[PDB]
Design a protein around this ligand. Structure first.
Ligand SMILES: OC[C@H]1O[C@H](O)[C@H](O)[C@@H](O)[C@@H]1O
Ligand SMILES: [Ca+2]
Ligand SMILES: [Zn+2]
Ligand SMILES: [Zn+2]
Ligand SMILES: [Zn+2]
Ligand SMILES: [Zn+2]
Ligand SMILES: [Zn+2]
Length: 435
C-alpha cells in the first residue's frame, strides 16, 4: 500500500453498503476506484459476501446458497451475483494487489439459504435444508448439516429462520475451511488476504480459531454487542479482532449530543474495546447495518487520529462526505497518529487530545469542536514544547503555523462545527515540516 499496510494497522475501506446498485456492476465499479483509493492511502478493501445467494440478483450475500458460485453459474435466476461475475471479482483483487492493497472476504457461515423442501427427522416437519442441487456441485448438504440434528439441537445462535449450520460436523468443517477444497481455500485461491466473519455470536470462537490456524491472514469478527468483556473474550479466544461497537455507540453519545464527557468517561473506564486493547479494536463511524452518527466529521477525525484500526464506510467516502477531508485524515492517520494518548482538555462540546508518537509517527494534537462557533483554548501540551506546530487539515481556512513555548503552552484553535456550511468542527496539529 502507499502508506501503512493492513497488518500494520492501515486504514480499511468497507467497499459497499446496503443494497448497492444491482445488475452485476459492483465489482467493476469498485475496481475502477482502486487507483484513487491507492493514492488516498487505503491499505485494504472489505468486500461484501461474494457467493450466490437465495435471492439471486437481489441478494447482498448474507443469505448464501452455493458458496462455490461467485457469479459463474445460472442459479436463482441469474449467472452473476448482485455484485458481478467471478472473473470481475478476480480482476478486482488482481488490481488491488497490483497496488499492494489487501482484500478482505466477508465470510457468512452461521447460516445458509435457498435450500429445497425436505423431511426433517429431528424437527418432525419439512425444512428447506436440501442443498443437493447447488450448481457448483461443491458443499452439498441436507438436514444433517444444520440444527437440529443427531449431535444437538442448537448452537450459540440463529439468524431469523435461516438453516443454521452445525460446524461440529466434519463434512461442514471439510467444506468450509478444513481442506484444499474448502470455501476458505477457494477464496484464498482467487486472492483474498483477510477475513471479516459475519455474526460470530451465532457459533463458537473455536471455529474462527481453527480457520485462522489453517489459513492465517488478518481477521475481524462481527460481534455486535456493547459488553466489552464479551467482545474481548471472543477476540482472545478466536485470535481475531472485533469491530468496536462499544466505541461506535459512545462516539454517537458524545458527538451527536454535545456530550463529550460521555466519551471521555467510556475511554477512562474501559467501556470501549480500543481503550482496553487497541490491537484488537477495529473502529468505524458507520457500516451497512447501522448508521446513527449524524456528525460524521468529528467522528472520522476521532477514529483516524485516535488508537485502533479505522474503517471508512464506502458511502461516506464516495457519496455523502467531502472526500478530500477523508483523504486528508487518512494521510494524517498514517503519518502522525501514533503512540499513547493523553486527553488535555474537554467540556460538553470540545475535546483536545495528544498522540505522543511512536517510532515512525511523530504524534499530533486533535481539537474537536461540536459548537457552532470558532473556539480557542490555551492548552498544556509539553509533548510539543519548544516546537513549530502546523495545522494539517486546512480547516482553519489556510496555512497556519504556531510556536509552542518551551513550557508546553500554546493557544490552539478549532473551526465551528457547521458542516452544512463547510465548517467541519476540528483541527489537527503536529510538528511543522512532516508532510
Ligand atoms: O450528509 C449525510 C448522510 O449522513 C449519514 O451518513 C446518514 O445516514 C445519511 O442518511 C445522510 O444522507
Ligand atoms: Ca448458529
Ligand atoms: Zn458482468
Ligand atoms: Zn452444531
Ligand atoms: Zn447519532
Ligand atoms: Zn472516489
Ligand atoms: Zn466548549
Amino acid at each position: 500500500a502507499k502508506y501503512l499496510e493492513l497488518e500494520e494497522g492501515g486504514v480499511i475501506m468497507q467497499a459497499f453498503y446496503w443494497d448497492v446498485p444491482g445488475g452485476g456492476i459492483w465489482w467493476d465499479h469498485i475496481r475502477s476506484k482502486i487507483p484513487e483509493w491507492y493514492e488516498a492511502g487505503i491499505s485494504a478493501i472489505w468486500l461484501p459476501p461474494p457467493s450466490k445467494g437465495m435471492s439471486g440478483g437481489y441478494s447482498m450475500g448474507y443469505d448464501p446458497y452455493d458458496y462455490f458460485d461467485l457469479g459463474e453459474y445460472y442459479q436463482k435466476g441469474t449467472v452473476e451475483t448482485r455484485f458481478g461475475s467471478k472473473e470481475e471479482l478476480v480482476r478486482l483483487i488482481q488490481t488491488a494487489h497490483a497496488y499492494g492493497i489487501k482484500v478482505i472476504a466477508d465470510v457468512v457461515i452461521n447460516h445458509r439459504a435457498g435450500g429445497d423442501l425436505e423431511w426433517n427427522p429431528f424437527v418432525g416437519d419439512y425444512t428447506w435444508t436440501d442443498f443437493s442441487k447447488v450448481a457448483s456441485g461443491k458443499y452439498t448438504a441436507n438436514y444433517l448439516d444444520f440444527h437440529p440434528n443427531e449431535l444437538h439441537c442448537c448452537d450459540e445462535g440463529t439468524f431469523g429462520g435461516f438453516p443454521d449450520i452445525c460446524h461440529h460436523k466434519e463434512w461442514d468443517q471439510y467444506w468450509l475451511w478444513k481442506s484444499n477444497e474448502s470455501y476458505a481455500a477457494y477464496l484464498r485461491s482467487i486472492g483474498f488476504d483477510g477475513w471479516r466473519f459475519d455474526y460470530v455470536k451465532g457459533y463458537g470462537a473455536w471455529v474462527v480459531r481453527d480457520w485462522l490456524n489453517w489459513w492465517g491472514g488478518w481477521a475481524v469478527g462481527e460481534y455486535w454487542d456493547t459488553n466489552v468483556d464479551a467482545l474481548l473474550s471472543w477476540a482472545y479466544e478466536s485470535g481475531a479482532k472485533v469491530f468496536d461497537f462499544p466505541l461506535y455507540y459512545k462516539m454517537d453519545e458524545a458527538f451527536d449530543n454535545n456530550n463529550i464527557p460521555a466519551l471521555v468517561y467510556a475511554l477512562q473506564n474501559g467501556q470501549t474495546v480500543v481503550s482496553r486493547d487497541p490491537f484488537k479494536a477495529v473502529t468505524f463511524v458507520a457500516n451497512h447495518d447501522t448508521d446513527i452518527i449524524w456528525n460524521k466529521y468529528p467522528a472520522y477525525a476521532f477514529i483516524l487520529t485516535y488508537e485502533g484500526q479505522p474503517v471508512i464506510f464506502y458511502r461516506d467516502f464516495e457519496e455523502w462526505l467531502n472526500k478530500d477531508k477523508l483523504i486528508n485524515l487518512i494521510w494524517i492517520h498514517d503519518h502522525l497518529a501514533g503512540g499513547s494518548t493523553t486527553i488535555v482538555y474537554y467540556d460538553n462540546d470540545e475535546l483536545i487530545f495528544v498522540r505522543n508518537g511512536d517510532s515512525r509517527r511523530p504524534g499530533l494534537i486533535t481539537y474537536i469542536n461540536l459548537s457552532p462557533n470558532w473556539v480557542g483554548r490555551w492548552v498544556y501540551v509539553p509533548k510539543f514544547a519548544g516546537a513549530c506546530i502546523h495545522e494539517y487539515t486546512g480547516n482553519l481556512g489556510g496555512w497556519v503555523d504556531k510556536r509552542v513555548d518551551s513550557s508546553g503552552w500554546v493557544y490552539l484553535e478549532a473551526p465551528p462545527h457547521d458542516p452544512a456550511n463547510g465548517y467541519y468542527g476540528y483541527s489537527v496539529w503536529s510538528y511543522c515540516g512532516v508532510g
